[PDB]
Amino acid sequence: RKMAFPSGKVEGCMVQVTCGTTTLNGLWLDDVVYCPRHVICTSEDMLNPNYEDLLIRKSNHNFLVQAGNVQLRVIGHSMQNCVLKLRVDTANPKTPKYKFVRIQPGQTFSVLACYNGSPSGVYQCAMRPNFTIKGSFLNGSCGSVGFNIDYDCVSFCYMHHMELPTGVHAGTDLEGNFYGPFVDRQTAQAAGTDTTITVNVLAWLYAAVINGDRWFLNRFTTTLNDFNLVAMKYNYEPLTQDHVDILGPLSAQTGIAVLDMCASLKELLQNGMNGRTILGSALLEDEFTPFDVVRQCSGV
Amino acid sequence: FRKMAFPSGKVEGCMVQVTCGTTTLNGLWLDDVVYCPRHVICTSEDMLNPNYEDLLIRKSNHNFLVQAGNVQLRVIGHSMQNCVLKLRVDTANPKTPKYKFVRIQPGQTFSVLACYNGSPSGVYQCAMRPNFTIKGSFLNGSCGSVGFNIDYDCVSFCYMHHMELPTGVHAGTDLEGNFYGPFVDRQTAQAAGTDTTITVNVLAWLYAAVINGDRWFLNRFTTTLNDFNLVAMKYNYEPLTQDHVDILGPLSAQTGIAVLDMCASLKELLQNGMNGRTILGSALLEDEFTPFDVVRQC
Ligand SMILES: *C(=O)[C@H](C[C@@H]1CCNC1=O)NC(=O)[C@H](CC1CCCCC1)NC(=O)c1cc2ccccc2[nH]1
Ligand SMILES: *C(=O)[C@H](C[C@@H]1CCNC1=O)NC(=O)[C@H](CC1CCCCC1)NC(=O)c1cc2ccccc2[nH]1
Missing domain, CATH: 2.40.10.10 (Trypsin-like serine proteases)
Incomplete structure (x- = not known):
């Protein structure tokens, strides 16, 4: 939640x-x-x-x-x-x-x-x-x-x-710089096409594993470059090095390497869930950060 | 709407x-x-x-x-x-x-x-x-x-x-120390009664979905209160009372959708499912927004 x-x-x-x-x-x-x-x-x-x-x-x-x-x-x-x-x-x-x-x-x-x-x-x-x-x-x-x-x-x-x-x-931000390409004029501005927040989906998969829901873990791995090229074909954001880094603690807690979880997500993107659920949901959730997953499972 | x-x-x-x-x-x-x-x-x-x-x-x-x-x-x-x-x-x-x-x-x-x-x-x-x-x-x-x-x-x-x-x-x-429900403060495994879905809240949230511009679940049909309650009970939804219908009054006025018209939409959603579609970003029928909550936020 x-x-x-x-x-x-x-x-x-x-x-x-x-x-x-x-x-x-x-x-x-x-x-x-x-x-x-x-x-x-x-x-x-x-x-x-x-x-x-x-x-x-x-x-x-x-x-x-x-x-x-x-x-x-x-x-x-x-x-x-x-x-x-x-x-x-x-x-x-x-x-x-x-x-x-x-x-x-x-x-x-x-x-x-x-x-x-x-x-x-x-x-x-x-x-x-x-x-x-x-x-x-x-x-x-x-x-x-x-x-x-x-x-x-x-x-x-x-x-x-x-x-x-x-x-x-x-x-x-609080220095007055707009997030994104917007300006403070009352003109026709449109949000560009959105994508799914890959680092947060991965965080959510780590959360599922922590809770014992791990059927999606597969036997494959990937390079970061290979995963990024595939993810962009599914309207997923490419991963940055900082993203790999902030998944560090969750990777350590579960023993699942970040690139192994990427390969698991890659399989889910290419094959769907097959009516299976993850954390009681057919949709991959992308608005929980690695910190949110950690904060929700600890008493900070 | 959040x-x-x-x-x-x-x-x-x-x-x-x-x-x-x-x-x-x-x-x-x-x-x-x-x-x-x-x-x-x-x-x-x-x-x-x-x-x-x-x-x-x-x-x-x-x-x-x-x-x-x-x-x-x-x-x-x-x-x-x-x-x-x-x-x-x-x-x-x-x-x-x-x-x-x-x-x-x-x-x-x-x-x-x-x-x-x-x-x-x-x-x-x-x-x-x-x-x-x-x-x-x-x-x-x-x-x-x-x-x-x-x-x-x-x-x-x-x-x-x-x-x-x-x-x-x-x-x-509560703050007088009385439990909600049949629970007791002893360290024992306790089961709740079978839960049910809060119907008046699902309807408020459907109205919220209309106020925010998605209408794909609406239909031309209508239903009586008693016939809706039969279907609701079949799907483990709580009964809709006339008080509930009145409480939804302002939201129905705001959208021009009679309450029993929205009940028919929820009946259709319950009987046909959501066909893999989503409402307000959710794939399930949300029941933790009250009519007040929806009004206060919209
Ligand atoms: C500030 O309080 C509001 C917050 C808006 C109002 C409704 N919901 C919100 O988030 N900000 C505005 O109303 C801005 C004011 C403009 C003043 C001059 C510089 C740019 C901001 N306007 C809009 O948010 C706005 C303009 C606009 C034009 C065409 C379609 C939609 C639209 N929304
Ligand atoms: C208070 O801080 C905690 C809050 C719990 C802990 C984990 N998540 C929560 O919300 N309260 C408890 O741990 C109570 C302890 C007392 C309960 C009343 C009488 C004295 C102990 N216990 C439980 O929440 C509890 C006990 C229990 C036994 C068997 C199956 C489930 C179970 N849950």
Whole structure:
């Protein structure tokens, strides 16, 4: 099952940011509030905004930052790629130990969906190979963030900016760089064709083996190159060296070499499951990372 | 459309660790009382069959080690309410939220904050199965983890975790210490009643699938409530009541699909299967979204 990180450390950082008639969410860490720069757009600014031009016209006193209904005075503003950084006069006492990280396709994170700076829910998301996420975002959710937690340290990896016509979502890291080829303009953008996250399917197969469900283990092995060429014919992502590395602990725990599991997956792709199931499912699951499998089987 | 849990922050501030002898689990710290499963007072030999009121009278306040973070809380009182131990401590929890203890109905959902050694580990949504189990994700040391709902900053606690059945499903109590279902806190292999599928929830989730733009399972047919219930019972689905039909009112208005029209679609899905197709990414009929859950998210 999909399990989110406890969200309390991020809840204490959510604020709302209003510029004109547009209110969205911001992330208050120390004395800086981070939010999508498109908060400074008017409804006619959105087709092709000149953000440098739009920001020159704005002053500190045009930005309404509120924790609940308590206003935080803005004392400075700047733009870093597609995120606005608003310096405020109060350091957030609830600021956790944190870092800003850019995740790879296939990595998962928890999203704290927020509206008017107020947390509404938390759920686990995977960054697809086409750099969209299947979020659950409504109007006003922009500036909601995705994160992982590692031993008290919150790693922020996603800030929400927009929905594509297909209903999936696109956003930036916390340095304002979009994931994938998207831009913050209200134009016809489409997610490129998605693929299956191979490293996560392998993680899921390791999880099946750990639980005693191992009929798919075969007597074959493969090279990484050979497997990658076949996997791409089935709309599976090629494996990287980092992928092989993050499967290391699961490979060690089960004694099944990563390339042996690749050969097992290759057989499943070429032959199907034959009505058999894996972990009580006819579909290969691709939204659990090796860390998710480990985290779910340990009390971290 | 995803499975969404409530933000856990208000609950995380209440989780503590409770130790008795060689047994460690989680407790819920509300004002000056810590609530935890009473089986913390069992020794390994006691767990076999425990006379709890007898085992508890033999315990002293100092037998209970309670830790909040690095701080240790002094137990100044202890009492039992059914299967829940209540440890009075000398410090009120300053992070205590507005809260209520509620006993939920089969079919209703709640968020679980899974904790280990008093520290929160993950949050996820669960439903009370019709047979009063929950399909959780709990490991050793998760006992005392709680399930809850949040309504306008009031936390309604509804579940406290006690055990894992041999089938891997889970069993626990409300916060008054009464088990959901026929289960008992003795270390014995316990089977649940035969589970059934939560019908009103499957329908809410079908409506959710419509709101998000997939309609391949809809049909032109309709059905009566009684004829649908005959087919549902044949497939081990719970009965659909008129109250359920009314509760689905808003979703039917939103999509313009009468409830009995959607029942006919589910009848078709049950009798013909999903032909290898999928709904909202799932190959099976999902029954852990309530009408409220779907409304709140859509
Ligand atoms: C921010 O709160 C919202 C989040 C959206 C709203 C509904 N569900 C979401 O995830 N963001 C937007 O509404 C953006 C605003 C634009 C302002 C200028 C720069 C680009 C973002 N717009 C969209 O998300 C959007 C535009 C668009 C055009 C044509 C079809 C679909 C579509 N979606
Ligand atoms: C508390 O932390 C654990 C949570 C379990 C452990 C593994 N996964 C879980 O959810 N609770 C237990 O281990 C209880 C211990 C007490 C139960 C009540 C009376 C005293 C012991 N036991 C079980 O969960 C358990 C015992 C048992 C015996 C035979 C078959 C299955 C079985 N499950």
